[PDB]
Design a protein around this ligand. Structure first.
Ligand SMILES: [Ca+2]
Ligand SMILES: [Ca+2]
Ligand SMILES: [Ca+2]
Ligand SMILES: [Ca+2]
Ligand SMILES: [Ca+2]
Lengths: 151, 155, 155, 154, 151, 155
């Protein structure tokens, strides 16, 4: 079912390079539905909770400028976004994908999408970055043509 | 070089306003449009189109779907046209389809999978889907000069 | 139904691979395709379409142009569609059309000027040109659901 | 420098355009400085469209800006208010020049995609930003690219 | 006739922001034919020689980084490139022009094309920035469809 | 971060209006143009480039092609630049190239396959190709600011 959600973040390199609209439209175009978005700075203390799993370089980077955090909704949202991003290392990512098209590095890899193979990391990572009041429930009319949900 | 395939923007792609994006993708590839009709598909054309799925539980929905709004039907011409269009389309189920494909960029669904192209691994499916959707006189026979640069044999 | 205008991609934009680029503009504007035909145009039809320019000295070159290879003929529906298309297209001589318009971005010639649209300043010209290039069973009547978001009155 | 309030109204969210609008402001060289996807309530809507509590189209105007979520933003830059009104195009998308956001995307007065604080209404930028966003939601930052957008940061 | 040529260039601000191809695309999409193109850095002498008519901000800007210098051929190309570029102050430039869509300053105004009203300027700036051997004389078949008399 | 590769939009891509498209793709990847030259290759330069192929049947059709019209020659710099350009080009036969690669989206032929990149699996090809088409006066050392957001190691 189509209420599944995932967490997607455009990282400081994305935001610095002016790629947020680019990332947003590839997810829109795919038919996924935005339920949360905010342009925020991440504090060392929040970085520490996220990457609680080179640790102090990936903190220095996730905290080096503004991020644009998002929640995205739709069928198999977590897999779909993670297919769309291509391999985490943008140097091995396939052309067509976000990292394969805009990226040329491991640490500055444009974005984060929750991992579909670490179960629940989708709900863990949205609880961490958003509260239930920064999240919207609405019906995207065009989802009737995105899926058998149709007239 | 005269190979022809039949290609259709399905009701879902028409509704989401991707007729243009899709055409662009096919002329961008180097393929020549030789027919193009914006039409509604009748219940019998649809039974004929999905005939091979007559025995199947998923045959009512298909037919409801494809007749649920207009399509933009097309024929494209080019070297190895049929497979080419199947490569740009992506896997039948959009969810399994590589980004960079029509279905992988635009679709998230098996049923509403945006588009159809004749199956290359089913000989004569291409010319049969053409005759089905198009009369002889609707197909247009032209010399697009930009093929001298799309194709080494036309140079 | 709403207002409707004849829109045509001309032989030059078909040859240059811009059909999809042109369709996309009218689609993302909010306009609804209602007719669409890839076709060739003969001198006869060309004489009847540019009937009014028969005396002028650029008639014979004009007719030779739109018969010089295929076109992509369409009908578009929406609020004020005849006017909106002509603003999208821009001034008739592409060298004077403004960037952002089809002709401004895509052409620079007045004869080879990419697209034709019904003249909203010429009463009923839209309806006459629609009836010329299409018949009623070629014009799909449908409900484009995203029109509820394009238009307040429709919602 | 200047900041402005720009909103993708519910028609633009629904139609899947928030990426396109955001891109056009990015490539113009302006700096996103806040942004937030949210549902507007009737209170906030009555307050934003308070210049028109008197007109007949008010009741319907407020039904629209609360009919679905919007994407609420703040952008910084040289003349950021005239410029984002310049890119938006005329209020009536039907008269909006092609090239602008309403001229390319819109075909209507009431569903006209986007809002951008009026630049003739001195202080509607600060007021409208003050109305949609608290200052904790606003990120100060130095965008290294602005050194090539502007010959005052070079 | 169709042999009119004009000089065009992507100024350093445009090279730094990765808009070389966006600008080239706009000009080829208009039907102009490229006959010269060279990625290059402008020494202060050539700068002074290019800006003869005029100044201290200019020189410092145009030598500030590499440019992409071009020459395009087509009907009324000088005028058409000027219309496509937009108003020198990119803040007064209309959306749909290069400066309208990309620029927010007049120092950093993305690009230069020869003034069509300053007669002979096209042939001068060309003849300055390119040796005649670097200008390519070819027939773009697509021009038979760009232009009626070339049909 | 200092590795360089030669890349060249071939006569077909030049002729079809794709220089900008290709240049955008590489720019967008975060690679850095360091040289760039619109030019005609003559028979002898085409022989030096495709010397590794005097032997084969297609040799003479290949230099025929590579000299049939101007090309746009380039050098790009970036981490792993030779291999990244090849990943973005796709397979050399365009008909096998995955959609989303250059040859995948834009081509439909073997000979007319749009673009050349230095083969990363041939040590020294990138530098030999660069030295052959360009001199060092033409290559530009400059510092791309955005690099410090493309690559972690540059910040
Ligand atoms: Ca069948
Ligand atoms: Ca008729
Ligand atoms: Ca009839
Ligand atoms: Ca050399
Ligand atoms: Ca030498």
């Amino acid at each position: 079912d189509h209420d599944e959600r995932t967490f997607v973040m455009v990282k400081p390199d994305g935001v610095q390079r002016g790629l947020i609209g680019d990332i947003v439209t590839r997810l829109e175009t795919k038919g996924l539905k935005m339920v949360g978005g905010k342009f925020m700075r991440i504090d060392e203390e929040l970085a520490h909770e996220h990457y609680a799993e080179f640790f102090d370089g990936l903190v220095s980077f996730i905290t080096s400028g503004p991020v644009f955090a998002m929640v995205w909704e739709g069928a198999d949202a977590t897999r779909q976004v993670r297919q769309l991003m291509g391999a985490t290392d943008a140097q091995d990512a396939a052309p067509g994908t976000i990292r394969g098209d805009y990226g040329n590095d491991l640490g500055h890899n444009l974005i984060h999408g929750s991992d579909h193979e670490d179960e629940g990391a989708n709900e863990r990572e949205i609880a961490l970055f958003f509260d239930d009041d920064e999240l919207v429930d609405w019906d995207r009319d065009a989802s009737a043509w995105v899926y058998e949900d149709l007239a």
